[PDB]
Coordinates of C-alpha atoms and ligand atoms in Angstrom, one line a residue:
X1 CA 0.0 0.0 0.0
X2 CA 0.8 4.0 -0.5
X3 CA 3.8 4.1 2.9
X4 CA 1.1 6.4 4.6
X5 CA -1.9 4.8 5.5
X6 CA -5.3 7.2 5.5
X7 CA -8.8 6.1 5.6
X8 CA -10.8 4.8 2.5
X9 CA -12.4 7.7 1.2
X10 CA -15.9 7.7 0.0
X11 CA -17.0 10.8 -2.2
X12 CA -20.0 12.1 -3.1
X13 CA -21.3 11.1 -6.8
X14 CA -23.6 13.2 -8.6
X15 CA -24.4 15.0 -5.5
X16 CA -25.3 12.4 -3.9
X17 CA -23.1 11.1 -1.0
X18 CA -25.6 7.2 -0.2
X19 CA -23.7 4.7 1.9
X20 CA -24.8 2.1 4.1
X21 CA -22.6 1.6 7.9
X22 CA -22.7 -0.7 10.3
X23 CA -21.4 -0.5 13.7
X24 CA -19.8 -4.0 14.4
X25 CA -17.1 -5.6 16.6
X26 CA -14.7 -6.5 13.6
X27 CA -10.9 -8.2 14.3
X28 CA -8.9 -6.5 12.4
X29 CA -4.5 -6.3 12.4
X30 CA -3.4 -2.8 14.4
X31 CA 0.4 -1.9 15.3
X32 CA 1.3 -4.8 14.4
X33 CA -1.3 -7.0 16.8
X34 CA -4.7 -8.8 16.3
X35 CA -7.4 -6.7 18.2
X36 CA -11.1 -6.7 17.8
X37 CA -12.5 -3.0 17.5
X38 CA -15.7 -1.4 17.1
X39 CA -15.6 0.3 13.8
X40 CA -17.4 1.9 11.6
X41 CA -17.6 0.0 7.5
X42 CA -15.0 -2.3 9.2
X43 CA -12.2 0.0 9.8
X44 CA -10.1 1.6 11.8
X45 CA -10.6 4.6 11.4
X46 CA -14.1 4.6 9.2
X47 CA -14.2 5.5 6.0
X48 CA -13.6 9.3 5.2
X49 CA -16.8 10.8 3.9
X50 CA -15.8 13.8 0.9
X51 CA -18.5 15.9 0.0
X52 CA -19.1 19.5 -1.4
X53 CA -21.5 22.2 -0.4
X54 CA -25.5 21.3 -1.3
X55 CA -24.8 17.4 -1.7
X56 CA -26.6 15.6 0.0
X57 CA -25.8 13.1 2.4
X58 CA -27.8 9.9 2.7
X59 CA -26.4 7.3 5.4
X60 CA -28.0 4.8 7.1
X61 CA -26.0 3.1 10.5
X62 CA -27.0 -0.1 10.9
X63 CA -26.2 -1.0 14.8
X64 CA -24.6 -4.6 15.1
X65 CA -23.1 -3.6 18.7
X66 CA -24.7 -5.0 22.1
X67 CA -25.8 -1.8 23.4
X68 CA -27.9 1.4 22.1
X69 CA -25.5 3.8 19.8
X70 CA -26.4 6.8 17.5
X71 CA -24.0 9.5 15.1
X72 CA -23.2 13.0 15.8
X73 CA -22.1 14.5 12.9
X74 CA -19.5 16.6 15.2
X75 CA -19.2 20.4 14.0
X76 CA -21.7 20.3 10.9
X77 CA -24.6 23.4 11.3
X78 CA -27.3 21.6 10.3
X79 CA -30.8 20.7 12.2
X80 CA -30.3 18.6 15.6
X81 CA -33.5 16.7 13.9
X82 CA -31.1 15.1 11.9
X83 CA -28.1 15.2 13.9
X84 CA -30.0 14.5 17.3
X85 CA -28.1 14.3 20.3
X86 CA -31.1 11.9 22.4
X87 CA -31.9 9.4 19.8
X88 CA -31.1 6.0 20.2
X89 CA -30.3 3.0 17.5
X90 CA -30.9 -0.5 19.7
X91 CA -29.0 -3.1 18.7
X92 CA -29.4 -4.6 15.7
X93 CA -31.9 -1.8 14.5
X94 CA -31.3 1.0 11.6
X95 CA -31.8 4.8 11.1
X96 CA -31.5 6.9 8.2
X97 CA -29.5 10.1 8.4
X98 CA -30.6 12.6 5.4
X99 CA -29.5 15.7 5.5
X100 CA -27.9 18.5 2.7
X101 CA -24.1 20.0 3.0
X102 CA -24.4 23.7 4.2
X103 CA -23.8 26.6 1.4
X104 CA -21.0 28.5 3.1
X105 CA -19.3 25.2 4.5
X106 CA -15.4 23.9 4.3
X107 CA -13.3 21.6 6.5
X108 CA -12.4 19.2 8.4
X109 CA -15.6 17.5 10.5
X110 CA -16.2 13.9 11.8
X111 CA -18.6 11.1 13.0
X112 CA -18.7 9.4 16.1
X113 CA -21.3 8.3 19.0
X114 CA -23.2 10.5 21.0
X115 CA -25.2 8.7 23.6
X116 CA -25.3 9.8 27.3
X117 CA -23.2 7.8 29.3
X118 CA -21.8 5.1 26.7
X119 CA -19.4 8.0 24.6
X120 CA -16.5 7.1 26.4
X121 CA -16.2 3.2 25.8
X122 CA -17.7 3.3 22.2
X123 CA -15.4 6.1 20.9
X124 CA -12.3 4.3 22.7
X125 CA -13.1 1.4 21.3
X126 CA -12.6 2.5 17.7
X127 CA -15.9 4.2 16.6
X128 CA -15.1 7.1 14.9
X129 CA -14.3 8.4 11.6
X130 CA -13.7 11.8 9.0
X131 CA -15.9 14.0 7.0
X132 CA -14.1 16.5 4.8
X133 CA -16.3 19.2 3.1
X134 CA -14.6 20.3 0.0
X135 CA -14.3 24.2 -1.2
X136 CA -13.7 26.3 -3.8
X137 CA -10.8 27.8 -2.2
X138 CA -9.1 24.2 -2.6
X139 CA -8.9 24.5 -6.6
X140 CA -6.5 27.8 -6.0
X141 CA -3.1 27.3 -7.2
X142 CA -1.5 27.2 -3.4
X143 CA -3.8 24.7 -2.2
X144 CA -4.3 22.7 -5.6
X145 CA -0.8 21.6 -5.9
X146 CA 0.0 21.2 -2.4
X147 CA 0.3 17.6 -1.2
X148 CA -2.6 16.1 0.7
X149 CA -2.9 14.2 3.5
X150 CA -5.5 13.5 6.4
X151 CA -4.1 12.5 9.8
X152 CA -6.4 11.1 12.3
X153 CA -4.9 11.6 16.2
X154 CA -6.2 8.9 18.5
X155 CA -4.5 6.5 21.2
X156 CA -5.7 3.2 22.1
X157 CA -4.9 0.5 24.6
X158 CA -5.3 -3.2 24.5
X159 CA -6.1 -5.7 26.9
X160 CA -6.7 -9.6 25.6
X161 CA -7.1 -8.1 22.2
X162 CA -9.8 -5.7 23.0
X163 CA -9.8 -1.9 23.8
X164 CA -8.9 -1.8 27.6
X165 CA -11.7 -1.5 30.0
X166 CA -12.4 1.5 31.4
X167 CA -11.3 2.5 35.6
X168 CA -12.3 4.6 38.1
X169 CA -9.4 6.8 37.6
X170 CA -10.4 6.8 33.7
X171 CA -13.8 7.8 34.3
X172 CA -11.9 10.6 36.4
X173 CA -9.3 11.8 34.4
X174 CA -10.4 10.5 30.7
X175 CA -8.8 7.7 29.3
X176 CA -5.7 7.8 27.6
X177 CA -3.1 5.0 25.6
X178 CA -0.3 3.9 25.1
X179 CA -0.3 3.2 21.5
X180 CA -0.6 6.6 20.2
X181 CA -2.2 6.2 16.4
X182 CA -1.9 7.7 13.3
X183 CA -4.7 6.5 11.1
X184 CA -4.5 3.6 13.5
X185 CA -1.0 3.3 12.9
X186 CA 2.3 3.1 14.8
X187 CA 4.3 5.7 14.1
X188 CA 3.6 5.5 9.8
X189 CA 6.7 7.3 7.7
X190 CA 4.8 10.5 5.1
X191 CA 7.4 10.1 2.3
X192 CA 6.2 13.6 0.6
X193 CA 6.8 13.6 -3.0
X194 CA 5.7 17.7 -3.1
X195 CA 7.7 20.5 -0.9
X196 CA 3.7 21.7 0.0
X197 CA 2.0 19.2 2.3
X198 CA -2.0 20.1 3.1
X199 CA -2.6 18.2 6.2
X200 CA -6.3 17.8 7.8
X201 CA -5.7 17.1 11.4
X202 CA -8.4 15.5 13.8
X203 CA -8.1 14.8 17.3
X204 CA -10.4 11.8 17.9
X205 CA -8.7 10.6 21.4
X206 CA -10.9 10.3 24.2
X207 CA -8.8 13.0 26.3
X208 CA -5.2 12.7 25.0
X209 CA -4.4 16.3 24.1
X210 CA -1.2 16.5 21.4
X211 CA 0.8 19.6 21.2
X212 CA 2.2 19.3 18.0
X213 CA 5.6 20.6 16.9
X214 CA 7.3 19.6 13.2
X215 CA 10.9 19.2 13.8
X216 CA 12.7 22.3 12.2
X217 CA 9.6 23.7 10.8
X218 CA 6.9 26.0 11.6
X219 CA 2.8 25.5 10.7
X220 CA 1.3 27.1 8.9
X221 CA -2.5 27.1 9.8
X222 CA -5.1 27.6 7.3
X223 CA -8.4 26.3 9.0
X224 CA -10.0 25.1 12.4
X225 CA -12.5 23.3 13.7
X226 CA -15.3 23.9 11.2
X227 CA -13.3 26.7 8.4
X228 CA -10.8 28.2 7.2
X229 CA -8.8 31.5 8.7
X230 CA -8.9 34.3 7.0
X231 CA -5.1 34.2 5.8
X232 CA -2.6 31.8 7.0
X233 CA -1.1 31.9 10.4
X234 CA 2.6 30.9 11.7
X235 CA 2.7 28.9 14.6
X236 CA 5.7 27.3 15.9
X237 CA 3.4 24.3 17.6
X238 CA -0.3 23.7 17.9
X239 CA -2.0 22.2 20.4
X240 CA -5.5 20.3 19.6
X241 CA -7.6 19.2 22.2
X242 CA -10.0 16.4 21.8
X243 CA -12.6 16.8 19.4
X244 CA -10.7 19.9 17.7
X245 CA -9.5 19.8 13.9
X246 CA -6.8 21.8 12.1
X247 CA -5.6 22.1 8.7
X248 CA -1.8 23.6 8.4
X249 CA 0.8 24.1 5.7
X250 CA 3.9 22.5 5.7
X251 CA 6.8 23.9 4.0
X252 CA 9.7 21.5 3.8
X253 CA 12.8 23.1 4.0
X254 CA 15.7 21.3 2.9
X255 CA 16.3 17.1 2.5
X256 CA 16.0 15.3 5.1
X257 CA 14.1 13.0 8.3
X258 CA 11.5 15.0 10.5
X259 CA 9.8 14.3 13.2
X260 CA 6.2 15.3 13.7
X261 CA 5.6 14.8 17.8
X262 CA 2.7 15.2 20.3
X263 CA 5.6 17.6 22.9
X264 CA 5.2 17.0 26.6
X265 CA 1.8 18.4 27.7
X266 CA 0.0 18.8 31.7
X267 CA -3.8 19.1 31.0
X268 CA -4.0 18.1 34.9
X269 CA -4.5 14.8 34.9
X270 CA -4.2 12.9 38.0
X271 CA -3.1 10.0 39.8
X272 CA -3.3 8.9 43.3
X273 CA -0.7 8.8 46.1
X274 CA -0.1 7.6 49.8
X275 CA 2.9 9.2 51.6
X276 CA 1.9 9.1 55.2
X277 CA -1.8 10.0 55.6
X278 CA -3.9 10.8 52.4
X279 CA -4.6 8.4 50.5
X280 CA -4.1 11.8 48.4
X281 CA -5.1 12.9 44.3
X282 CA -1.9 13.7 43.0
X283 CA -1.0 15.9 39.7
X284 CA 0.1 13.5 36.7
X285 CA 1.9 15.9 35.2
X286 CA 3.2 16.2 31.6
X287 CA 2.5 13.7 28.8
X288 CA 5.4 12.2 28.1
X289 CA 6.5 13.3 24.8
X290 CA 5.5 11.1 21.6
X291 CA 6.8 10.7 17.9
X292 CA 3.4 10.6 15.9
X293 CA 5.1 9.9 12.4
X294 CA 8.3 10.4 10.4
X295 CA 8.2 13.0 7.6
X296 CA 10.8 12.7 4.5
X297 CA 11.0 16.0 2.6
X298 CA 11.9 15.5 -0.8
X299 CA 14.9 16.4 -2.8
X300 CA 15.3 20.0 -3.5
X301 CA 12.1 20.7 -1.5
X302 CA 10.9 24.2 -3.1
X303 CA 7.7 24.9 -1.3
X304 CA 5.0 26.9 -3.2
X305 CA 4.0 30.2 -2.2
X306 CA 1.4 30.6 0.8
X307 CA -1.5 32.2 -0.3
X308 CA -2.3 35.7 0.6
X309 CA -5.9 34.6 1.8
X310 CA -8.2 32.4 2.7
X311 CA -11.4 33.2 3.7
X312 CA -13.4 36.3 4.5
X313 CA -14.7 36.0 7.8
X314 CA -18.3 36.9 8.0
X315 CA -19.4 40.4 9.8
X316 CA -21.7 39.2 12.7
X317 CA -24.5 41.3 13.8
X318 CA -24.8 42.2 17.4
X319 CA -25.4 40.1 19.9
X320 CA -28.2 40.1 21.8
X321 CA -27.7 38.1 25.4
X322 CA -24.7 37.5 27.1
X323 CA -24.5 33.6 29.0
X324 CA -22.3 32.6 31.3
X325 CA -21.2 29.0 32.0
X326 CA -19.0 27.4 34.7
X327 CA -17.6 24.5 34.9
X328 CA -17.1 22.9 38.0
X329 CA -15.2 19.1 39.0
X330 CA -16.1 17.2 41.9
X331 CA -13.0 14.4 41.5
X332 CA -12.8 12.1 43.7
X333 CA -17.0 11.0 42.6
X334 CA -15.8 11.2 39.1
X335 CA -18.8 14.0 38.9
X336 CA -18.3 17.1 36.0
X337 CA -20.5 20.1 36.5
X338 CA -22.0 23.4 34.4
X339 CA -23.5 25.9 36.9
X340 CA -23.4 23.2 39.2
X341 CA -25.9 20.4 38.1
X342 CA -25.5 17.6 35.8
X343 CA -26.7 16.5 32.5
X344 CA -30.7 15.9 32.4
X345 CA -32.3 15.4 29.2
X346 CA -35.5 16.4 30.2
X347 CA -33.9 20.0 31.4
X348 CA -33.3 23.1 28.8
X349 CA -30.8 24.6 30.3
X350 CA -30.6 27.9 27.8
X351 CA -33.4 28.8 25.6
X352 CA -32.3 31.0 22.9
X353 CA -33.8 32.9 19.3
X354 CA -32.6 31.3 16.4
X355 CA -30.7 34.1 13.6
X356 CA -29.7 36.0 16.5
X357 CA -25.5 36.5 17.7
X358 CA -25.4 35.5 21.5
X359 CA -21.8 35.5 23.6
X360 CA -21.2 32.6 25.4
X361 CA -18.2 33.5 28.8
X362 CA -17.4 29.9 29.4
X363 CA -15.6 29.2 32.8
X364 CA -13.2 26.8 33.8
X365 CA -13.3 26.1 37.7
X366 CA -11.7 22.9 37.9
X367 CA -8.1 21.7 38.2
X368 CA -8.0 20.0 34.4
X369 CA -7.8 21.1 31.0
X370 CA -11.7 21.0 29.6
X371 CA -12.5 21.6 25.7
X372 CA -15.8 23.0 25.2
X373 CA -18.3 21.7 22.5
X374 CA -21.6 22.9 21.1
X375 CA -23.3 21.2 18.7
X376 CA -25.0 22.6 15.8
X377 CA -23.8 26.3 15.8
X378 CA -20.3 26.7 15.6
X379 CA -18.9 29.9 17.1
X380 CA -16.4 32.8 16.8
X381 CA -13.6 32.5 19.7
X382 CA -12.6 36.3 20.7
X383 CA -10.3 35.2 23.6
X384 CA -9.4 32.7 26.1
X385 CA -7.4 33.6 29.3
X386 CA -7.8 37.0 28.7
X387 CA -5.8 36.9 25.7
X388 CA -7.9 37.7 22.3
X389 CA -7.7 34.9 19.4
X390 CA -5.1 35.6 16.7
X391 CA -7.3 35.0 14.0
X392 CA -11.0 34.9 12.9
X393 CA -12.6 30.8 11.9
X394 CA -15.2 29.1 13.1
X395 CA -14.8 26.3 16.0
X396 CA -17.1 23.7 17.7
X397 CA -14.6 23.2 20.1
X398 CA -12.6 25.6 22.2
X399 CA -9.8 24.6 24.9
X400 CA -10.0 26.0 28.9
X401 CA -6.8 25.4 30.8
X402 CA -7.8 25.6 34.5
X403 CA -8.9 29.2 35.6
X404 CA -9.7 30.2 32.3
X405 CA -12.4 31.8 30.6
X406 CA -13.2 31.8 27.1
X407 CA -15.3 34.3 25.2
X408 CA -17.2 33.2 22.5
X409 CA -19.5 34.6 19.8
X410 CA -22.7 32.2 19.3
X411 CA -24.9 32.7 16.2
X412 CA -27.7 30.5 16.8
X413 CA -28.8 28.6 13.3
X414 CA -31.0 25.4 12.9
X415 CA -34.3 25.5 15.5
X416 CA -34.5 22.7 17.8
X417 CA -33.0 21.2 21.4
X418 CA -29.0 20.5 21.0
X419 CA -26.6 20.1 23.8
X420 CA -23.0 21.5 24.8
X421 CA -20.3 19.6 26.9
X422 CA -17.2 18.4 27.9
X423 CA -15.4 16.6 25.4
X424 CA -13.5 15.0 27.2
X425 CA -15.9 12.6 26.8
X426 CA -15.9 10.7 29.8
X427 CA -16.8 13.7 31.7
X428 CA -19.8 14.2 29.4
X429 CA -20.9 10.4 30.2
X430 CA -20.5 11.9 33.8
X431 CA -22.4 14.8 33.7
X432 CA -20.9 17.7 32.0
X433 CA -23.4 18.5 29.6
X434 CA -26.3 20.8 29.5
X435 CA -29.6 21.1 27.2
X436 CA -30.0 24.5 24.8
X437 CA -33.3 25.0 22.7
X438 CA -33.4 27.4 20.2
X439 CA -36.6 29.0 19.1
Ligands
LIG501 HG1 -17.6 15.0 19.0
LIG502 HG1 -21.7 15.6 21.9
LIG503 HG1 -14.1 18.0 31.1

């Protein structure tokens, strides 16, 4: 095979993107070991969906797993009728998702479960796969002949050839593994052929954050979560939290091996000690540091120009309510909070005006790193910690180091009752997760 491994990709034809999935226990050969997963068209990861604006998308999950599972179709603005956060597909039942690709879309998106309380085992376990949404802005010249490559971020441990049970201390912390994936493989070598590579990053861990850093090289990024940037932006690392996506630039410089690694990293887990008394929480401390793949630049690597722009972000008009949500961590229960209750599906929390601009001060009051999803409308980030965002894109997920507080602009869109939450998404299956309806 190509000495990269990426997902099959299924695309759209004639507008029309039909498919049929089933969600099955499938053994399957992984870094090297036998291992049954739970995958999605019996891969790991699932199949990569590629589809343009106004196709429509037509796919039916067929559940073959033990236990109740459903899709979220994570960062795509369109109705929660379709992408509904409180249905359930028993086992060994169907649904049809139908839905059509947003006018003013582009990106990087993905499909996973979202079912209260069963997130964390079923995503671990190997249920998740990419949706790219193609764009106009990919046929210019910088983008066009820039070498492309999706890489899917997710870690996984094993236990008698099956994703490793959960723990207290998982449910606590969010689980994390040793073998940390690339396309669900170990450390895979990107021979590039172009001096441009175009590379779609998604962070599908349960809670493993990666900073990355490309030996030698900057990034250059061109699009988040759910769009572009408005012109490309330098960064010497980037760090995506679970659930976020990216799309950078590389520019190889000169001949030669580079590593691309996940850098050390404290997002506050924590472990448990005894010294003398407590049987006391302890800080984790840093992710050890990780080599995610080997890059090989090219002979001669002359990188194209970057181009001048991107995207024009969109003016939004004013908003009209301000929210406020804190988070909050009992630890030691395993219990997550926002505005101090937990989840309950038969609670709105917010009830907002659809076509109107809300902002959204979202708090941090724990210890850990948590990253911040809404479904449905994705959002304008204007600062975090104080410090305001160095460019203009739309996200669906937004970091919060401990302490922090992130401002975020919220156009509502589709009517209907969606959620927000955690995703680290154990701490959603605990609790942190709350109900808005938009009107
Ligand atoms: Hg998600
Ligand atoms: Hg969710
Ligand atoms: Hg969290």
């Amino acid at each position: 095979g190509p000495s990269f491994p990426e997902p099959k990709v299924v695309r759209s034809q004639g507008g029309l993107l039909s498919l049929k999935l089933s969600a099955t226990p499938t053994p399957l050969a992984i870094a090297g070991q036998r291992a049954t997963l739970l995958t999605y068209g019996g891969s790991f990861p699932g199949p990569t969906l590629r589809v343009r604006p106004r196709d429509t998308v037509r796919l039916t999950l067929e559940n073959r797993l033990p236990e109740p599972t459903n899709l979220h179709w994570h960062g795509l603005p369109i109705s929660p009728k379709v992408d509904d956060p409180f249905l359930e597909i028993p086992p060994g039942e169907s649904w049809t998702y139908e839905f059509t690709v947003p006018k003013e879309l582009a990106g990087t998106f993905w499909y996973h479960p979202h079912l209260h309380g069963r997130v964390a085992p079923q995503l671990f376990a190997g249920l998740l796969g990419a949706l790219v949404v193609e764009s106009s802005l990919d046929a210019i010249p910088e983008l066009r002949e820039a070498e492309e490559h999706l890489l899917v971020l997710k870690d996984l441990a094993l236990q008698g050839g099956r994703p490793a049970p959960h723990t207290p201390m998982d449910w606590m912390n969010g689980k994390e593994g040793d073998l940390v994936l690339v396309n669900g493989a170990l450390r895979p070598t990107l021979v590039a052929q172009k001096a441009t590579l175009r590379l779609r990053l998604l962070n599908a861990s349960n809670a493993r954050y990666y900073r990355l850093a490309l030996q030698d090289h900057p990034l250059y990024l061109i699009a988040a979560d759910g769009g572009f940037l408005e012109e490309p932006l330098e960064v010497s690392e980037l760090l995506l939290a679970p659930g976020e996506r990216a799309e950078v630039l590389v520019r190889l410089r000169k001949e030669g091996r580079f590593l691309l690694q996940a850098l050390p990293y404290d997002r506050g887990a924590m472990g448990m000690m005894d010294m003398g008394g407590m049987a006391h929480a302890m800080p984790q401390g840093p992710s050890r540091p990780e080599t995610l793949l080997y890059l090989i630049a090219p002979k001669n690597p002359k990188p194209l120009p970057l181009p001048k722009a991107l995207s024009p972000f969109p003016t939004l008009p004013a908003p009209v309510v301000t929210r406020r949500l804190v988070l909050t961590e009992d630890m030691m229960a395993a219990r997550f909070f926002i505005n101090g209750q937990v989840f309950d599906h038969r609670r709105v929390d917010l009830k907002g005006q659809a076509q109107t601009v809300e902002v959204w001060e979202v708090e941090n009051q724990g210890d850990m790193d948590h990253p911040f999803h809404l479904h449905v409308h994705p959002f304008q980030v204007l600062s975090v910690g104080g410090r305001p965002f160095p460019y203009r894109a739309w996200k669906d997920v937004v970091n919060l180091k401990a302490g922090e507080v992130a401002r975020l602009l919220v156009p509502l869109r589709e009517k209907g009752r969606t959620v927000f939450h955690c995703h680290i998404v154990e701490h959603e299956d605990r609790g942190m997760m709350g109900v808005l309806e938009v009107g």
